[PDB]
């Protein structure tokens, strides 16, 4: 449901794509195990820190 709404709403999407999952339904697939909390939290953590660095670079350019 969420993926189809994202397509309809032109919202780019990222998703973990397991071997039984359809890659074309998302803009940026990440091939990987989606059943283990360790694997998911590992990939989520990397994406979350990447976002944090972007946020820190935006707040830094405002200061200087």
């Amino acid at each position: 449901n969420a993926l189809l709404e994202a397509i309809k709403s032109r919202v780019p999407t990222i998703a973990i794509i397991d071997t039984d999952s359809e890659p074309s339904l998302v803009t940026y697939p990440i091939p990987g195990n989606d059943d283990s909390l360790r694997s998911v939290n590992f990939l989520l953590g990397v994406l979350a820190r990447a976002g944090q660095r972007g946020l820190q670079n935006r707040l830094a350019r405002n200061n200087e």
Partner: protein
């Protein structure tokens, strides 16, 4: 499980082992880096990033990511 294979994922598969398909981590790393750069770009641009996960136990990771 190889019995549950969605053959549209064929190009991501490294092989089968112990009745399951092994995902090619070399491609996972490249896709992950590309996805990470997108998150960084949207965050640096001020966009709204929504993290959706509804499997049991994911809340803690999802809340900290947000």
């Amino acid at each position: 499980s190889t019995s549950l294979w969605r053959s549209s994922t064929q190009s991501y598969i490294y092989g089968e082992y112990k009745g399951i398909h092994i995902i090619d981590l070399n491609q996972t790393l490249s896709y992950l880096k590309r996805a990470a750069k997108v998150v960084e770009g949207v965050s640096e641009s001020g966009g709204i990033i929504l993290f959706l996960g509804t499997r049991q136990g994911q809340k803690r990771g999802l809340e900290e990511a947000a």
